[PDB]
Amino acid sequence: EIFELKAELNSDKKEKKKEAVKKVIASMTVGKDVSALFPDVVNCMQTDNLELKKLVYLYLMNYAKSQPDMAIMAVNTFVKDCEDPNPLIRALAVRTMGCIRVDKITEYLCEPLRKCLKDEDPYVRKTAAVCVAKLHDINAQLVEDQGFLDTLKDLISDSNPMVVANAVAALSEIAESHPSSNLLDLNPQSINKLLTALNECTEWGQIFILDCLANYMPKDDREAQSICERVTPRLSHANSAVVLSAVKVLMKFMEMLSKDLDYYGTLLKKLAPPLVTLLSAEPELQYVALRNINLIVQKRPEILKHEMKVFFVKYNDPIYVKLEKLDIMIRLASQANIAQVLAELREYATEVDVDFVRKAVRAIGRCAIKVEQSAERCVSTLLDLIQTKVNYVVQEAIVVIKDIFRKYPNKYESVIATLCENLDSLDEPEARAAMIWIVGEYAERIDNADELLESFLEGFHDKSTQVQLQLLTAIVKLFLKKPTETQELVQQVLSLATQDSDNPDLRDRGYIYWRLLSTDPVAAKEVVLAEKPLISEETDLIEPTLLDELICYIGTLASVYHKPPSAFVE
Amino acid sequence: MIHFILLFSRQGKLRLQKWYITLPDKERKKITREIVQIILSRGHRTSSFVDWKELKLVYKRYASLYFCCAIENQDNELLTLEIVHRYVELLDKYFGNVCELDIIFNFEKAYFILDEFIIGGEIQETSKKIAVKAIEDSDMLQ
Amino acid sequence: SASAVYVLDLKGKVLICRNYRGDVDMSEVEHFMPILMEKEEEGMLSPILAHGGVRFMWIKHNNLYLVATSKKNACVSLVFSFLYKVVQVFSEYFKELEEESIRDNFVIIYELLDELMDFGYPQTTDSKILQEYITQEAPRPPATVTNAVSWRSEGIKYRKNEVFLDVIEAVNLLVSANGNVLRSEIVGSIKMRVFLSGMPELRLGLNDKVLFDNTGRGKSKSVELEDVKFHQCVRLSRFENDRTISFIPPDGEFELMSYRLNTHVKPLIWIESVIEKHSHSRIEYMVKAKSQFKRRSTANNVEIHIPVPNDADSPKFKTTVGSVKWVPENSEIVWSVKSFPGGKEYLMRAHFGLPSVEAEDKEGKPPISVKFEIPYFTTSGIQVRYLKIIEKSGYQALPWVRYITQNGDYQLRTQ
Amino acid sequence: PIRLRELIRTIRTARTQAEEREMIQKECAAIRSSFREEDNTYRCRNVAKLLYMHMLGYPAHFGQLECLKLIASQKFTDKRIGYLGAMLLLDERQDVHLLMTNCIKNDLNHSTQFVQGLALCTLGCMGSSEMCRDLAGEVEKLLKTSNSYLRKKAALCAVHVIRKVPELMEMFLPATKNLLNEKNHGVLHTSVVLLTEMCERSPDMLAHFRKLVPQLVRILKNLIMSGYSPEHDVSGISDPFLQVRILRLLRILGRNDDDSSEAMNDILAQVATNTETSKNVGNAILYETVLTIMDIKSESGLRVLAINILGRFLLNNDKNIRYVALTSLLKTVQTDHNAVQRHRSTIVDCLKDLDVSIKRRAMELSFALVNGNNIRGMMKELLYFLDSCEPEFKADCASGIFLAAEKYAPSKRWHIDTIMRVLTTAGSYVRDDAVPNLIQLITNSVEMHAYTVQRLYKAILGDYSQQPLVQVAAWCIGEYGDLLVSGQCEEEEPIQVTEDEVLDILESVLISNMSTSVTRGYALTAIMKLSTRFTCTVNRIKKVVSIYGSSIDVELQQRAVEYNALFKKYDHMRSALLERMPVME
Amino acid sequence: SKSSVIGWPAVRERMRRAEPAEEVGFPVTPQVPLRPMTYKAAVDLSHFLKEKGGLEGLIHSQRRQDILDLWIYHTQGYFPDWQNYTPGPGVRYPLTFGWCYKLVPVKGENTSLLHPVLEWRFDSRLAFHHVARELHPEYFK
Amino acid sequence: TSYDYCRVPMEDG
């Protein structure tokens, strides 16, 4: 079976050993443990067919870790094939060399690597540049022991910017794997050399040399401006990753440019039509953008403050897309588009995607706190959705109406007259507890607040912690507002929360309110009916301490996590 | 009391549900999805029973198809597996070389075989002959 | 920055696996699909997953999950742009990309994985030049592979010299339930089909507003491109200066440029639809379709997709011109009209029933999307002025173009 | 219209579920359109194809009226389709199922027993409580018949209506009288399950039914002595399904009686010896036999034998039997309590078993095995087993640790020590509901709070993210702060209590995002008490209350402002209500 | 033999679900050229059946043949008379010049309750040495 | 491509 395969593998005819190694990596394709036949396909490796040698290189790379000791039977064959005058077969070995990770091997292969560092063809030299970082991946100190760092610094000084960009991508890799001991930054003249090398190399190479710019910071304004004027034509390229790498350093380098110059406004006006066009991409790539755009408006809200309509979701959009568009509308919620947003969000509460609807309810509420202008019209929008009589639409609304009333408590008592009748058999305790505060805080214009809490005072011993605590909050607030009709009401809630409740904070605030009522309820008009200050809002702007670090991380996971780069890597 | 019966494939593809307890379809689609996930995430020496949420949930693999019950937590368990096997026998009886693809096809009578065997969640005929006799007579009635 | 890029199927078994760093274990792939079962069924779906420290960048093809795994703070758009490129290059090789394309052609596909990327660094992704040394039927790599010009090999020779352009309009539209246009931008895209001899440098000029403003012709017909994204081959530094579309094209079909602009003029076709949804009873769609565009122009083979309810039944259609097919499989109707000229206004009166029992759950409101196509008609008014063929050998090519206006996202939010 | 299996074959060709839904809504429309045609021809198959989609999980609410038409059909096959989907598409909360009530009632009077068998099938499976009220006299009428094809069905249907309507069984007390001599076993089986049901609901029915205990003692002895029948026999064991139901009926009878318990004593001594324990069947016979013996006031020679039966069942390598044996001693915990305790190491062995349910039964029976004698040693296994739980068992163990510890703690200190151990090692696994219970018992504890609050303080400096841990601590700091920082109104020689990091560690919770806000609910509560429980550094804690008056949690914005006016206006009335809370049960 | 791969398990399933022991008329695919199963294509097919597998040693029957032959006509455009074999007496040799497979003689619930045939053989000289011509000389001239 | 082409100038001087 495998031995008949090893019989054809130890055959002398090419057509039998060629079909044998195809079955092996087809057995590897179907995921068979073909590691037991390791050194036997190694015998049919040094072949004249270049088409066949890729299959063994495929096998040897895959089973290097599995057979680390048996992997010593290829070192001579690599240095054999780093010398064949086909540059295709040399770089094929070189990329097979660096990806094979056996520490018994990597010490031997530095010299044919050093040989291919100073090879002729750009093809193998851009391949050999990465294999240094592959070696620095495997053994970092052997590379400096081989002193390959400067040879990589000299392929930066090569022409044909593809070799230069493959040198840079390995350089920014190794300098990352370095502790920045001997930081690999260069003068602006190499940055002049790379920016001239920018207009020639491939779309991938244009990315990787924008990434060496993620470490450099210019020291003058014209120095910053002149390099940015050559990064500026990159914003009309089809690869958004070329564009996103370009925007990342432009957001980085605009902290050096003078706002007093018009080039700062020129840069920002040349920045917005690319950023909108990134939303015309594929939604996964747009999901990359939406986390990056989130990072932008927190830093520079000035750019895309004119654009809201492109942040309107569509029906066919993915769910991770549709949630993130709602965030930027919050991040762009201004006076000039209070009507555009709330009508759109009202069209978004008409959806069956509940979490999108649940986010859209929060999107109205974050709009109501960000602008106090349509804070009246936000409430009017929500009460319509309260009158849709959809439970989660209602159950998300009541928490929000509370927070508007926590934010803007003043002239919204014309709202609770609707909301005193709002189907009080609402079940969700986050909005049940929202109901009890809104009733409790506004227990003067809801004139029947005592009798509606009687339904809320039936199954009191097993509701929640908050809902029972809100009922302990509101009744004492209600009895302090009306001590006439709620006299037995304030005593029976102390009869349940202090005596027949084990909930200790409910026992804490129970006996506190019971003693405060027993000591001085008139002083409780000063104590618990105290004029509460303006609530300090949760500023969800990411800290510029972290945000300026994340200016350097755009299009990397640190932006798509809105985290520092170490907080999620291991 | 058998609360329900589930027959789901090696791929979890449900070939039978029979809710002897009245719970709504969202709950039907929730609970069925979970237990299929539970049983398929369960090994071969795991005692053929699950204590799943006050239901001593009985599972017993016979083929690629998997099997499920929810017995009341006061009743017998190996007999509950024998109930499955007696029903397996009756499927083996009325069909003979009882097999996967007409479970996919002729499921309508497999319900009717269950209707000749378990109504209400309990056994009505403890003989294996008299029940398949009656369904043949109603098949002879057509 | 990739470490191990994998291809899964709809079941989650590995169609093909390829690591580039060894920093992600090969058996990590078996957790992805249950996490994919996890995140989706809780609605926490993202194109990046995470099983501890392994980050799961993936796209989704028809069957396929091009899962690229990494662990560090990798460059994200570096990954996914390569992911759609690998789809593209496979689409360049395999005319359909499915499970049959992989398991039958693992000879070439593993070689592509060796070639397109090293270590996580894409180095060679132009498929047209990649055909010259990676064949499914090996010589040295071409100089164009070494060359900064990496899209066009030398020595390409034809009998004729034909430059086939396709200025294609794509009308986006967002009309709300109110009947106002929310978002109607136009994303036009000129896609070139080059059949030329040698190494030409093509220089293009349009009715650009800025280029006419630099000329002094900013009073005549000039399209205003809000943003364009071009090919690599366009020398953008030359374009940044003076709106100069100068490039050496690749050989064959390729999209050169991708312009985008807003337009505050009417939609080419206005739709008025109504819904007489009678509870437990029936529904009626007296929908009309007026054409606002030019009367010489004709909207070919339009396909008006109006979302109907799922349990809608007994269809009745009083059209005027054009047939309806009811598609319950998409729960909709396609009132199809083949020839629909500008100025024309055709009504359709639909009538279904509805079950006297209600359904269990809600359905939501999809908008109406139609599938118009108008040839020889630039709604934005873009005009190619010339195309300078510059060959060192020197020839007179045959530049050719046609204009086609289609929909982009032509959504019109229903009642 | 195509057939069912033609549809299924098309469905079996579907690859993507979304693509499969296209094939669903393809055919579903034709099913709908046929329903608009009021067809009677293909109404058989269109419903059958629909129920497949219902089994495929698709909204088939619409065709339910056609099922009522198929029940109200006249062809037998259309009924045969019609009664099925009535059990499928309809339930009690379907609310349209009430139209079956006339249709079934006519078809309880149909000539064919199989049509009436369909009617007893559908009502027995899913008959609604009011449909049970509307068919009660007809079922007992079909229980007064002689058709054993129907008597097996009307009996279990009568169970259903007694299950659904518990106040209805009194009209079935006359129905069940003296049909216990049925030659058929299946009708006799359903009668036992009915008498299982009738004895279950009402204790008033037990007096009429314990009389016929020796009647079935004979008939069960007939089942043992009729050692073979060509039917009912599985593996040489004759009608085991009936035999267990008799034992279960004999389990619920005689459970507080003795004369019937002695009237059943003989066959219990018989079948405990006269069973074949080889196959799975005779174990299932002997399992209920064990459970029957434990629950009645039985012979003592049965129960001693029964633990010896179970000692065998503890040692069988069948995990089924191990699940059986662990469930067995889980049943008879209190009954024959110490003959269980000699099997203790077998239970500690099954803690190391590689099955969830076996580890589940062993952990819970270990929670049941704890007396006041094994309380010290077994907890050390269990606190080790709490470390060696699965995270599903970690929530399950840590509560069940707290349950048996509140029972049989030989010390109050060691009671604290184990709970403090668990609260350090459970953390996110221990339930928040036991936290007022733990708070209650440590204030039921009166003597060691200087012992307690220091050890409370010594671990919360380790972490705060264990939320039920720091739920416990903040109340202790608020109440027994005087026992933490003691006589340290000013700076002294440095003891580990320092009355400022004491105040900082609560402040650390208030800013930390890993705070459940009832952590922050307890914390401001502890801040305001240490305005009185501490005389050392107050009015720096007033600053913390005052800055918290603009907080984003609603009640925690209430809590700070309601505290702060006492800190600003009624500083003497702060301590006027900060007496310690009373202690309850 | 490219589009014969996508139904290679699918139609063979319908063959295997066919027992080895409305509609009217015959449609013709428009504008597709038709030809019989030629020699080199039968060499292309006998190796397609040699390589793709699942056919050799299978229970041959006539119902499976007619399921197969019409599927070749509708998906590949070949006259479905090519899978003709010699009759009962003798080895069922193919009359087709180029078919290298001769035919030698050798669900489950559709069974009732209580109960009250060929196979292939590869022969690569059937393409040249027409053994069915030796069994039928007077018909082939 | 059933639609037909149209020839642009080359130079547009």
For B95-142, what is the HEC assignment? CCCCCCHHHHHCHHHHHHHHHCCEECCEECCCCCHHHHHHHHHHHHHC
Residue C359 and residue D61: Cβ atoms within 8 Å?
A: yes
Is D521 within 8 Å of chain A by CB?
A: yes
User: Which chain D residues are closer than 8 Å to B105 by Cβ?
Assistant: 4-5, 8
User: A444 to chain C nearest CA, in Å?
Assistant: 39
Q: What DSSP element (H or E) covers D452? A: helix D450-460
CB C350 within 8 Å of CB C324: yes
Output phi, psi for A389, to 5 deg. 60, 40
* CA gap A122, A163 in Å, rounded: 6
Of A232, A235, A557, which has the smallest distance from its Cβ to C76's Cβ? A557
* CA gap D362, B77 in Å, rounded: 17
Tokens found for residue C232: 């690599």
* CA gap D400, D366 in Å, rounded: 9
Q: Which of B95, B116, B132, B133 to mutate to test the interface with E (most CBs of E within 10 A)?
A: B95
Tokens found for residue A553: 């991380």
Which residues sit directly before a break in chain D (C to N > 2.5 Å)?
none
User: C100 to chain E nearest CA, in Å?
Assistant: 9
Is B51 within 8 Å of chain E by CB?
A: no
Tokens found for residue B37: 């996930």
* CA gap A285, A279 in Å, rounded: 8
Q: Chain C residue with minimal CA distance to E2?
A: C100
User: Which chain B residues are closer than 8 Å to E115 by Cβ?
Assistant: 96
CA atoms within 13 A on the CB side of E60: 21
Output phi, psi for C140, to 5 deg. -70, 160
Resolution of this entry, Å: 6.8
Partners of A540 in the β-ladder: none
CB C210 within 8 Å of CB A219: no
CA atoms within 13 A on the CB side of D201: 19
Tell which residue, C99, C134, C132, has the closest CA to residue C115.
C134
* CA gap B95, D429 in Å, rounded: 50
Q: List strands edge to edge, sheet with C14-19.
A: C14-19, C4-8, C65-70, C54-60, C48-51
Coil, strand or helix: which one is C164? strand
Helices B107-115 + D76-89 axis angle, to 10: 80
Instruction: For tokens 């059937």, name the residue.
Output: E126
CB D402 within 8 Å of CB D431: no
For D158-225, what is the HEC assignment? HHHHHHHCHHHHHHCCCCCCCCCCCCCHHHHHHHHHHHHHHHHHCHHHHHHHCCCHHHHHHHHHHHHH
Partners of D551 in the β-ladder: none
Q: Collect all residues with Cβ–Cβ distance below 8 Å to A62 and sequence separation of at least 6.
A: A28, C19
* CA gap A557, C121 in Å, rounded: 17
Give the residue numbers in F contacting C (CB under 8 Å), as ranges. Answer: 1, 3-12
Partners of C402 in the β-ladder: C166
Residues in chain D: 585
Tokens found for residue C124: 């060679």
Instruction: For tokens 């002049």, name the residue.
Output: A192
Q: Collect all residues with Cβ–Cβ distance below 8 Å to D194 and sequence separation of at least 6.
A: D155, D156, D158, D159, D162, D172, D176
CB A542 within 8 Å of CB A232: no
CB atoms within 10 A of CB D303: 19
Instruction: For tokens 């009668």, name the residue.
Output: D191
Burial C170-201 (b: 16+ CB within 10 A, else e): bbbbbbbeeeebbbbbbbbbbebbbbbbbbbe
Round the CA-based radius of gyration of chain B to a whole number and report it: 15
Touching pair D, C by Cβ (3+ pairs < 8 Å): yes
* CA gap A168, A152 in Å, rounded: 8
Q: Collect all residues with Cβ–Cβ distance below 8 Å to D580 and sequence separation of at least 6.
A: D479
Coil, strand or helix: which one is C290? strand
CB C260 within 8 Å of CB A277: yes
For A15-30, the DSSP string reads HHHHHHHHHHHHHHHT
Tell which residue, D433, D538, D402, D525, has the closest CA to residue D475.
D525
Report residue B118 CA to chain centroid gap: 10
Is the backbone of residue D547 left (phi > 0), alpha (psi -120 to 50) or beta?
alpha
Residue B94 and residue E113: Cβ atoms within 8 Å?
A: yes
Round the CA-based radius of gyration of chain C to a whole number and report it: 26
What torsion do the CA atoms of D474, D476, D479, D484 make, to the nearest 10 degrees? -110
CB A268 within 8 Å of CB A300: yes
CA atoms within 13 A on the CB side of D417: 9
Burial of D181 (0-12, 13-18, 19+ CB in 10 A): exposed
Helices (H), C190-298: 209-215, 236-242
User: Which chain A residues are closer than 8 Å to C148 by Cβ?
Assistant: 160-162, 200-202
Residue A536 and residue D550: Cβ atoms within 8 Å?
A: yes
Is B56 within 8 Å of chain E by CB?
A: no
Burial of E53 (0-12, 13-18, 19+ CB in 10 A): exposed
CB atoms within 10 A of CB C386: 16
* CA gap B3, B19 in Å, rounded: 6
Give CA separation, D260 vs D131, D178, D216, in Å: 37, 18, 11
User: E91 to chain C nearest CA, in Å?
Assistant: 36
Instruction: For tokens 């929500």, name the residue.
Output: A382
Q: Chain D residue with minimal CA distance to C326?
A: D29
CB F5 within 8 Å of CB C400: yes
* CA gap C325, F4 in Å, rounded: 30
Instruction: For tokens 């006339």, name the residue.
Output: D102
Angle at C274 between CA C269 and CA C276, to 5 degrees: 160
Residue C146 and residue A122: Cβ atoms within 8 Å?
A: yes
Burial of E2 (0-12, 13-18, 19+ CB in 10 A): exposed
* CA gap D322, D313 in Å, rounded: 7
Q: How many helices and strands, by DSSP H and E, does chain D display?
A: 33, 2
User: C338 to chain A nearest CA, in Å?
Assistant: 26
DSSP code, position C142? P
User: Which chain C residues are closer than 8 Å to A280 by Cβ?
Assistant: 187, 260
What torsion do the CA atoms of A510, A516, A517, A521 make, to the nearest 10 degrees? -140
Tell which residue, D322, A204, B56, D432, has the closest CA to residue C126.
A204
CB C17 within 8 Å of CB C69: no
User: B48 to chain D nearest CA, in Å?
Assistant: 6
Pairing outcome for strands C162-175 and C398-412: parallel
Is A553 within 8 Å of chain C by CB?
A: yes
Is A525 within 8 Å of chain D by CB?
A: no
Tokens found for residue C172: 């986006």
CB atoms within 10 A of CB B126: 25
Tell which residue, D527, D437, D436, D517, has the closest CA to residue A433.
D517
User: B117 to chain E nearest CA, in Å?
Assistant: 16
Is C191 within 8 Å of chain F by CB?
A: no
CA atoms within 13 A on the CB side of D25: 19
User: E strands along C111-160, which residues?
Assistant: 117-118, 121-122
Output phi, psi for C394, to 5 deg. 90, 110
CB C113 within 8 Å of CB C77: no
Burial of E88 (0-12, 13-18, 19+ CB in 10 A): exposed
Partners of C407 in the β-ladder: C171
* CA gap D4, D23 in Å, rounded: 13
Of D12, D239, D354, which has the smallest distance from its Cβ to B104's Cβ? D12
Tell which residue, D190, D122, D127, D121, has the closest CA to residue D163.
D127
* CA gap D468, D398 in Å, rounded: 12
Tell which residue, E10, E117, E121, has the closest CA to residue E57.
E121
Instruction: For tokens 């291919």, name the residue.
Output: A116
User: C359 to chain D nearest CA, in Å?
Assistant: 6
CB atoms within 10 A of CB A48: 7
User: Which chain D residues are closer than 8 Å to C326 by Cβ?
Assistant: 29
User: Which chain C residues are closer than 8 Å to E6 by Cβ?
Assistant: 100
Q: What DSSP element (H or E) covers D234? A: strand D233-234
For D550-566, the DSSP string reads G-SSHHHHHHHHHHHHH
Output phi, psi for A109, to 5 deg. -100, 0
Instruction: For tokens 């105290």, name the residue.
Output: A530
Tokens found for residue C320: 């005027």
Is the backbone of residue C261 left (phi > 0), alpha (psi -120 to 50) or beta?
beta
Q: Which of B65, B99, B104, B107 to mutate to test the interface with E (most CBs of E within 10 A)?
A: B99
DSSP code, position F9? P
Is the backbone of residue D2 left (phi > 0), alpha (psi -120 to 50) or beta?
beta
State which amino acid sits at residue D213.
Answer: V
CB B47 within 8 Å of CB D359: no
Which residues 12-71 in chain B show a CB within 8 A of chain D?
Answer: 14-20, 22-24, 29, 42, 45-51
Is E116 within 8 Å of chain B by CB?
A: no
CB atoms within 10 A of CB C138: 16
Residue D84 and residue B111: Cβ atoms within 8 Å?
A: yes
Which residues 302-341 in chain A show a CB within 8 A of chain C?
Answer: 309-310, 312, 314-316, 318-320
Residue D190 and residue B17: Cβ atoms within 8 Å?
A: no
CB C260 within 8 Å of CB C321: no
Helices D375-387 + D356-369 axis angle, to 10: 150
Contacts 24+ apart (CB under 8 A), A401-406: A401/A434, A401/A438, A402/A434, A402/A437, A402/A438, A402/D554, A403/A365, A403/A369, A403/D554, A404/A365, A404/A368, A404/A369, A404/A375, A404/A378, A404/A379, A405/A438, A405/A441, A405/A442, A406/A535, A406/D554, A406/D557
User: D44 to chain A nearest CA, in Å?
Assistant: 35
